[PDB]
Design an enzyme around this catalytic site. Structure first.
Site, PDB file in Angstrom:
ATOM      1  N   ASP A  58       0.837  -1.198   0.000  1.00 25.11           N
ATOM      2  CA  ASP A  58       0.000   0.000   0.000  1.00 25.11           C
ATOM      3  C   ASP A  58       0.870   1.244   0.000  1.00 25.11           C
ATOM      4  O   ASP A  58       1.906   1.251   0.626  1.00 25.11           O
ATOM      5  CB  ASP A  58      -0.888   0.058   1.256  1.00 25.11           C
ATOM      6  CG  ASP A  58      -1.827  -1.136   1.387  1.00 25.11           C
ATOM      7  OD1 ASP A  58      -1.506  -2.226   0.888  1.00 25.11           O
ATOM      8  OD2 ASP A  58      -2.883  -0.986   2.020  1.00 25.11           O
ATOM      9  N   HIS A  60      -1.172   4.600  -0.392  1.00 28.79           N
ATOM     10  CA  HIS A  60      -2.168   5.553   0.130  1.00 28.79           C
ATOM     11  C   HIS A  60      -1.789   7.019   0.034  1.00 28.79           C
ATOM     12  O   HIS A  60      -1.755   7.718   1.061  1.00 28.79           O
ATOM     13  CB  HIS A  60      -2.542   5.208   1.599  1.00 28.79           C
ATOM     14  CG  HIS A  60      -3.433   4.012   1.714  1.00 28.79           C
ATOM     15  ND1 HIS A  60      -4.691   3.967   1.148  1.00 28.79           N
ATOM     16  CD2 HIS A  60      -3.239   2.807   2.300  1.00 28.79           C
ATOM     17  CE1 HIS A  60      -5.242   2.795   1.406  1.00 28.79           C
ATOM     18  NE2 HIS A  60      -4.371   2.063   2.080  1.00 28.79           N
ATOM     19  N   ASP A  86      -4.189  -0.088  -3.599  1.00 31.18           N
ATOM     20  CA  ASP A  86      -4.309   0.927  -2.516  1.00 31.18           C
ATOM     21  C   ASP A  86      -3.314   2.090  -2.674  1.00 31.18           C
ATOM     22  O   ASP A  86      -2.505   2.379  -1.779  1.00 31.18           O
ATOM     23  CB  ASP A  86      -4.226   0.300  -1.123  1.00 31.18           C
ATOM     24  CG  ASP A  86      -5.529  -0.336  -0.711  1.00 31.18           C
ATOM     25  OD1 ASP A  86      -6.399  -0.542  -1.581  1.00 31.18           O
ATOM     26  OD2 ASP A  86      -5.700  -0.647   0.484  1.00 31.18           O
ATOM     27  N   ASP A  89      -6.485   7.379  -1.288  1.00 33.90           N
ATOM     28  CA  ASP A  89      -7.167   7.517   0.013  1.00 33.90           C
ATOM     29  C   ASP A  89      -6.174   7.676   1.163  1.00 33.90           C
ATOM     30  O   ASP A  89      -5.029   7.254   1.041  1.00 33.90           O
ATOM     31  CB  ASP A  89      -8.043   6.303   0.314  1.00 33.90           C
ATOM     32  CG  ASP A  89      -9.306   6.293  -0.471  1.00 33.90           C
ATOM     33  OD1 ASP A  89      -9.723   7.370  -0.960  1.00 33.90           O
ATOM     34  OD2 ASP A  89      -9.900   5.189  -0.579  1.00 33.90           O
ATOM     35  N   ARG A  90      -6.655   8.242   2.278  1.00 35.28           N
ATOM     36  CA  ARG A  90      -5.905   8.473   3.535  1.00 35.28           C
ATOM     37  C   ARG A  90      -4.796   9.510   3.446  1.00 35.28           C
ATOM     38  O   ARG A  90      -4.806  10.482   4.220  1.00 35.28           O
ATOM     39  CB  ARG A  90      -5.400   7.166   4.147  1.00 35.28           C
ATOM     40  CG  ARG A  90      -6.514   6.104   4.285  1.00 35.28           C
ATOM     41  CD  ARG A  90      -6.933   5.854   5.727  1.00 35.28           C
ATOM     42  NE  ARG A  90      -8.135   5.010   5.840  1.00 35.28           N
ATOM     43  CZ  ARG A  90      -8.254   3.755   5.386  1.00 35.28           C
ATOM     44  NH1 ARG A  90      -7.249   3.154   4.748  1.00 35.28           N
ATOM     45  NH2 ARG A  90      -9.403   3.098   5.554  1.00 35.28           N
ATOM     46  N   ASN A 118      -8.511  -2.666  -2.636  1.00 30.81           N
ATOM     47  CA  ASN A 118      -9.901  -2.377  -2.280  1.00 30.81           C
ATOM     48  C   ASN A 118     -10.263  -0.883  -2.366  1.00 30.81           C
ATOM     49  O   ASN A 118     -11.438  -0.541  -2.539  1.00 30.81           O
ATOM     50  CB  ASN A 118     -10.297  -3.013  -0.954  1.00 30.81           C
ATOM     51  CG  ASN A 118      -9.490  -2.522   0.187  1.00 30.81           C
ATOM     52  OD1 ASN A 118      -8.254  -2.544   0.149  1.00 30.81           O
ATOM     53  ND2 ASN A 118     -10.179  -2.094   1.252  1.00 30.81           N
ATOM     54  N   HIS A 119      -9.248  -0.008  -2.294  1.00 23.21           N
ATOM     55  CA  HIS A 119      -9.455   1.442  -2.423  1.00 23.21           C
ATOM     56  C   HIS A 119      -9.507   1.921  -3.863  1.00 23.21           C
ATOM     57  O   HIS A 119      -9.842   3.065  -4.091  1.00 23.21           O
ATOM     58  CB  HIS A 119      -8.405   2.241  -1.632  1.00 23.21           C
ATOM     59  CG  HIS A 119      -8.621   2.176  -0.159  1.00 23.21           C
ATOM     60  ND1 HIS A 119      -9.154   3.223   0.559  1.00 23.21           N
ATOM     61  CD2 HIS A 119      -8.453   1.160   0.719  1.00 23.21           C
ATOM     62  CE1 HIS A 119      -9.302   2.860   1.821  1.00 23.21           C
ATOM     63  NE2 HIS A 119      -8.873   1.616   1.947  1.00 23.21           N
ATOM     64  N   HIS A 167      -4.131  -8.057  -3.779  1.00 26.37           N
ATOM     65  CA  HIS A 167      -4.164  -7.086  -2.680  1.00 26.37           C
ATOM     66  C   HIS A 167      -4.505  -7.669  -1.307  1.00 26.37           C
ATOM     67  O   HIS A 167      -3.729  -7.522  -0.352  1.00 26.37           O
ATOM     68  CB  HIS A 167      -5.118  -5.924  -2.973  1.00 26.37           C
ATOM     69  CG  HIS A 167      -5.067  -4.877  -1.911  1.00 26.37           C
ATOM     70  ND1 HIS A 167      -3.941  -4.121  -1.687  1.00 26.37           N
ATOM     71  CD2 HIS A 167      -5.956  -4.521  -0.959  1.00 26.37           C
ATOM     72  CE1 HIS A 167      -4.148  -3.320  -0.661  1.00 26.37           C
ATOM     73  NE2 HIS A 167      -5.364  -3.545  -0.201  1.00 26.37           N
ATOM     74  N   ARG A 215     -13.621  -6.427   9.475  1.00 23.96           N
ATOM     75  CA  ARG A 215     -13.900  -5.283   8.592  1.00 23.96           C
ATOM     76  C   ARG A 215     -15.382  -5.214   8.215  1.00 23.96           C
ATOM     77  O   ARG A 215     -15.830  -4.207   7.656  1.00 23.96           O
ATOM     78  CB  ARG A 215     -13.064  -5.325   7.300  1.00 23.96           C
ATOM     79  CG  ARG A 215     -11.545  -5.390   7.468  1.00 23.96           C
ATOM     80  CD  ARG A 215     -10.862  -5.665   6.103  1.00 23.96           C
ATOM     81  NE  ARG A 215      -9.422  -5.898   6.253  1.00 23.96           N
ATOM     82  CZ  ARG A 215      -8.492  -4.960   6.090  1.00 23.96           C
ATOM     83  NH1 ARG A 215      -8.837  -3.728   5.743  1.00 23.96           N
ATOM     84  NH2 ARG A 215      -7.215  -5.264   6.241  1.00 23.96           N
ATOM     85  N   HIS A 242      -2.376  -4.820   2.171  1.00 21.49           N
ATOM     86  CA  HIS A 242      -3.731  -4.668   2.743  1.00 21.49           C
ATOM     87  C   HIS A 242      -3.754  -4.493   4.275  1.00 21.49           C
ATOM     88  O   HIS A 242      -4.695  -3.902   4.817  1.00 21.49           O
ATOM     89  CB  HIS A 242      -4.617  -5.848   2.263  1.00 21.49           C
ATOM     90  CG  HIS A 242      -6.086  -5.740   2.582  1.00 21.49           C
ATOM     91  ND1 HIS A 242      -6.830  -4.587   2.396  1.00 21.49           N
ATOM     92  CD2 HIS A 242      -6.962  -6.686   3.007  1.00 21.49           C
ATOM     93  CE1 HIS A 242      -8.091  -4.824   2.726  1.00 21.49           C
ATOM     94  NE2 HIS A 242      -8.199  -6.090   3.096  1.00 21.49           N
TER      95      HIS A 242
HETATM   96 MN   LIG Z   1      -4.688  -0.080   2.493  1.00 21.64          MN
HETATM   97 MN   LIG Z   2      -6.587  -2.509   1.351  1.00 18.36          MN
END
Ligand SMILES: [Mn+2]
Ligand SMILES: [Mn+2]
Ligand SMILES: [Mn+2]
Ligand SMILES: [Mn+2]
Lengths: 294, 157, 294, 65
Positions: A58, A60, A86, A89-90, A118-119, A167, A215, A242
């Site tokens: 990741d 991000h 990923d 995001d964040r 997943n993002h 991922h 989750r 992940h």
């Molecule tokens: Mn992530």
């Molecule tokens: Mn993820």
């Protein structure tokens, strides 16, 4: 398209105070999304890759951490790359991050690879910051262009017929690689089922087979699930991302699975290193770590 | 670029390497490269707001099921000749993230005379500013600040 | 709207190789247009200004020449400024130019003033470069936002009741300053009439009263027209722009009119200096010249 | 990199016949001449402006509206 000029501007902030933006034009970003999408669709959804390769988890939107990864790993095309998703995001610089990655995919399409995380899904990156960054810096229409692009990303890769990369992780429904190959693109990621699990599931040492995932999505799987999967498919290793791990890499089920995470001091809320796994021509795996200074 | 690395203990020797495993793991020391401290690179993000994002999103999904059309109204001394209300999703819709709808169309006013805008139409955009998922006051402030030939995107089922 | 951050980034290219872009966000630029439109409309259409003041002519998207004006004249709020129009078109950086000027207008609303030039008009800046800049670097909807803004720019200024300032010049229809004060905004610039003439007319040595204008718009006016207008309104000087002049400033009708031009080596096709005129609190006028080096 | 060292040149001449009731004055002091970029350091040309092509496009946008 203007690719080399775009890459130059993205890399211009090397040596700048981290956090400094690179603002490309909307038309430039659109061009990256459109060309990369064409490329993703022309390549298999389940990639078949050959070593040497460097594998990252990741990012991000931690753009200046991505720049360090390429600095120590070697900038494309001196090393081959597979990222596990990923990208967005964040972090505060998802746009610079994803644009540089897409630029290199377009420039070096046979030596540079991006999986879907997943993002890389509208329902997720709408909420966890990428839509906000698009809206503030550009417009909502550019966020929709990214969704179209993300919806065409490949889902998994197999390296030299021995390392299975995705991922999240495995699916209780995954019995044949052909189940991955038959997924048509563009596609959204569903709330349940094979494609969801590949992007969402986690290993868990305390579950035996398949358990529920904290989750509220997908499942956890145990060491025995991993052992059977590798045996069935004549594979050596699952590489996934992940989950934040303290040293940037962490093994599971002995050495049968590894988690990679490449966002150091993740979103300023964790103290963790980032890491990359290098796989050489002879399939010797090693780890190189990215540690924030104190 | 900074290229100096330190080394740490590498992966331990494996006691049982599976019989026909092809890949290998190095026992050599692990190279540790430096990136920025949190003082130098603030990796925090305080602007991520998933509860606000979700309410906006639901309204955006509703708007996408609508027929969208442009309207241009010449604003005069009597304004645009519409009044608006904000409506959100569900009983616990806040004041924060609303759709903006035409409550009234003033007789003799610009909206009325133009013919296109009707009661219950959603105002989706004004002068390139989105009114989907905004406060009723943001919306009223935008419309009051409009001048001359005002550009709308209007939504209707 | 983060004005100080916007101004910082526009100013950060000081000492860079001229021609380097500052790419603001679409929203920052739209915010500059909306905020400045509110201020323009809250101020008179015929401004009434008091010295000390520095008055500048055309810039035409020559951004680094604008920076030089401020560096030698004093950055706001150190100096008070009045610009006479033609900020956009012809040059390659109309966006940076107009953004910096709008930013300063918002930041120092009582010490910084912008008049409308003939190029602050959609029908003109559609074809002379500004539309193309917007479409290339942003989108067409942003261009229409600029039009909303430009349509509310004031038309003329009078300094200490003695210096009449406008972009172009006089109008055969202009009899009372009330004809200017009563113009309602937003407005387009018509193909003919008072408002056209103020933004489009030129002085001519060879014409007696009112002549044909080679531009195919508006008129020329002679020295006698200047003398008559000044005597009628109890004024000492007309300050205008709109024509490239070799030294950056040039007198007409003895010293009853001055043309100011602030874009040196105008679009690489002329060798001219740029100039500004300073008026001090005693109403002493001086000229400062910006001359391209060899 | 801005050159703050202006050179001075002869200023505006004294006017012989100043209008009777004029309030403004014109300085006779030396004029400051600041150096700015040469064409070599700052290429001010723009090959991208095409008023003829833009007019044709515009005419089609007007027929659309
Ligand atoms: Mn992530
Ligand atoms: Mn993820
Ligand atoms: Mn001009
Ligand atoms: Mn002009």
């Amino acid at each position: 398209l203007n690719l080399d000029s775009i890459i130059g501007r993205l890399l211009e902030v090397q040596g700048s105070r981290p956090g400094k933006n690179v603002q490309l034009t909307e038309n430039e970003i659109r061009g990256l999304c459109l060309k990369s999408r064409e490329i993703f669709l022309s390549q298999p959804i389940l990639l078949e890759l050959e070593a040497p390769l460097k594998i990252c988890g990741d990012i991000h939107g931690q753009y200046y951490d991505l720049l360090r990864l390429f600095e120590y790993g070697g900038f494309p095309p001196e090393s081959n790359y597979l990222f596990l998703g990923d990208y967005v995001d964040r972090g505060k610089q998802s746009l610079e991050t994803i644009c540089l990655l897409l630029a290199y995919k377009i420039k070096y399409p046979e030596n540079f690879f991006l999986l879907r995380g997943n993002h890389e899904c509208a329902s997720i990156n709408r909420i966890y910051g990428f839509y906000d960054e698009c809206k503030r810096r550009y417009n909502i229409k550019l966020w929709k262009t990214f969704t179209d692009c993300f919806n065409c990303l490949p889902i998994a890769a197999i390296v030299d017929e021995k390392i299975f990369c995705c991922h999240g992780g495995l699916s209780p429904d995954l019995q044949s690689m052909e189940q991955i190959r038959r997924i048509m693109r563009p596609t959204d990621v569903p709330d349940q089922g094979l494609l969801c699990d590949l992007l969402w599931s986690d290993p868990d040492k305390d579950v035996q087979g398949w358990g529920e995932n904290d989750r509220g999505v997908s499942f956890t799987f145990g060491a025995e699930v991993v052992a059977k999967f590798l045996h069935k498919h004549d594979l050596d290793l699952i590489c996934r991302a992940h989950q934040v791990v303290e040293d940037g890499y962490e093994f599971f089920a002995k050495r049968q699975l590894v988690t990679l995470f490449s966002a150091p001091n993740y979103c300023g809320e964790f103290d963790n290193a980032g890491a990359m796994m290098s796989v050489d021509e002879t399939l010797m795996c090693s780890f190189q770590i990215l540690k924030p200074a104190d | 670029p900074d290229m100096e690395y330190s080394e740490i203990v590498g992966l331990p020797q494996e006691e049982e390497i599976p019989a026909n495993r092809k890949i290998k793991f190095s026992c050599a020391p692990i190279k540790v490269f430096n990136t920025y401290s949190n003082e130098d690179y603030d990796r925090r993000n305080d602007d991520v707001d998933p509860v606000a994002a979700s309410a906006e999103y639901e309204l955006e999904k509703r708007v996408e099921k609508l027929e969208l059309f442009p309207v241009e109204l010449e604003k005069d001394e009597d304004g645009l000749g519409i009044s608006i209300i904000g409506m959100g999703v569900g009983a616990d819709a806040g004041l924060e993230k609303l759709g903006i709808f035409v409550k009234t169309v003033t007789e003799g006013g610009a909206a009325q005379r133009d013919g296109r805008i009707q009661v219950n139409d959603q105002i989706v955009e004004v002068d390139g500013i989105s009114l989907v998922g905004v406060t009723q006051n943001f919306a009223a402030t935008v419309l009051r600040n409009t001048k001359g030939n005002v550009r709308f995107v209007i939504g209707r089922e």
